């Protein structure tokens, strides 16, 4: 009675929609890491991250990792709608050795690495409205070159800025030209940032240098979806409750397995 315990060791693929991000994290699938290209525009009721997951692309550091991770988790969808920004005066589709797609240089499939064009990089100013009723999530980045010669050779600007503003929030990032530890043959880094454009709001990009432009918006979908870091196998069965240690019967009133439950689950009780 009371506590359930009695874990099974497997997560049932029914009735909830389960997605096994084998080798792939949600943030990695959101950005477009080459080994996660099979997750594009896919939905889920519960997304399971693995401890074996890794990143095999440009080195990124998300400042507020938990919130952006929790944002896409609740929507339960990676539906990406392409928009056509007028990036006039610059060159797009910048590739590097780290992000190798089909044995060829590439980049994040959801990002656009704007660089110099004809040795001229003007002050870009683009705006896109949220005419639609669903809130838009724009994912952008800021490149941190290794040396000043790189900052000049990519952007022809001694320094750059990136300002992403809305009716309610204005986000400004200033590049930090430094020599971070070498990862995948690169000493530079890129900082991922997010901005939600509510209906009736506009997105203002004021970037004067080192802009990792977004290729479109994502869909904030009202849903009961969420995520759970677990290394348990996803077996074929039906179980209404799900824990990181395996599916759990919801018949007993309380659970002592873990404070991480999804769906109709007995509330948690401590072990001791």
């Amino acid at each position, epitope marked *: 009675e009371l506590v359930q315990s009695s874990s099974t060791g497997r997560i049932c693929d029914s009735p909830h929609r389960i997605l096994d991000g084998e080798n792939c994290t949600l943030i990695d699938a959101l950005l477009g890491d080459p080994h996660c290209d099979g997750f594009q525009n896919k939905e889920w009721d519960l997304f399971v991250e693995r401890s074996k997951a890794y990143s095999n692309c440009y080195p990124y550091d998300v400042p507020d990792y938990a919130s952006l991770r929790s944002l896409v988790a609740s929507s339960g969808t990676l539906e990406f709608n392409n928009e056509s920004f007028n990036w006039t005066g610059v060159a797009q589709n910048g590739t*590097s050795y780290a992000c190798k797609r089909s044995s060829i240089k590439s980049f994040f499939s959801r990002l656009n690495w704007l660089h110099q064009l004809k040795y001229k990089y003007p002050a870009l100013n683009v705006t896109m409205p949220n005419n639609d009723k669903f809130d838009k999530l724009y994912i952008w980045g800021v490149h941190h070159p*290794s040396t000043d*010669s*790189d900052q*000049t050779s*990519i952007y*022809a600007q001694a320094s750059g800025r990136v300002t992403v503003s809305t009716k309610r929030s204005q986000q400004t990032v200033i590049p930090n030209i430094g020599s971070r530890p070498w990862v995948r*043959g*690169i000493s530079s880094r890129i900082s991922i940032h997010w901005t939600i454009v509510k209906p009736g709001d506009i997105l203002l990009i004021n970037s004067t240098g080192n802009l990792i432009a977004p290729r479109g918006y994502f869909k904030i979908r009202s849903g009961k979806s969420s995520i759970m870091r677990s290394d348990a196998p996803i077996g074929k069965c039906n179980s209404e409750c799900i824990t990181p240690n395996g599916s759990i019967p919801n018949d007993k009133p309380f659970q002592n397995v873990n404070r991480i439950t999804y769906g109709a689950c007995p509330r948690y009780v401590k072990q001791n």
Partner: antibody
Amino acid sequence: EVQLQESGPGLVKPSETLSLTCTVSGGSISNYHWTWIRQPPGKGLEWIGDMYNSGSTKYNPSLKSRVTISVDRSKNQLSLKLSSVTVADTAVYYCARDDIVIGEGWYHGMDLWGQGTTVTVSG
Amino acid sequence: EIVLTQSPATLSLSPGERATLSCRASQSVSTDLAWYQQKPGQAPRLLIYDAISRASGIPDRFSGSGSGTDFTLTISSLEPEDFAVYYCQHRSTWVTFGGGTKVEIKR
């Protein structure tokens, strides 16, 4: 428009030092990476060296002890210096700019490439 | 050191035909090769960079391809103003050029 013009002699007797100056008009010389390339008669193109934005220089290993590429701000000129001139150095020398991004692995470009001071090495 | 060898040494093709120029390399290079056109008595002109990407002014008739060891350049509809010696260049750790292939339009 960034434009280049090679200025140099027409004959350099052997054992001397070749001096070639590349003057650039319509651009900033401290910015942009540059490189020197020579074309021996009927032999093809060969890389001499290159100076980058950082001022650091990199020369072809076969011709390191004799090559020196310098720049003179307040003159906006690129100076190539090839010591101990032999007749193998008889070529058409060219100064060119490169679109290199050292560090990010972006090696793509030759763009502006010059005119070509023909240098004959003989007594 | 990496060495580039172009084949064939000389191509003779009538106008409107298609040109195919190869640049086999000694070691793996990846998409780090560029093609150049040197008109007689003139400048080499950058045609293709990063094996496939075309530069400014370079029309669509020029189309390079390749990835490691073997790289090729394809000139569609050879026009009389294409007579030049074409070179391939690699650029990493050091700079190495090719032997050159002379294309001769045939009237």
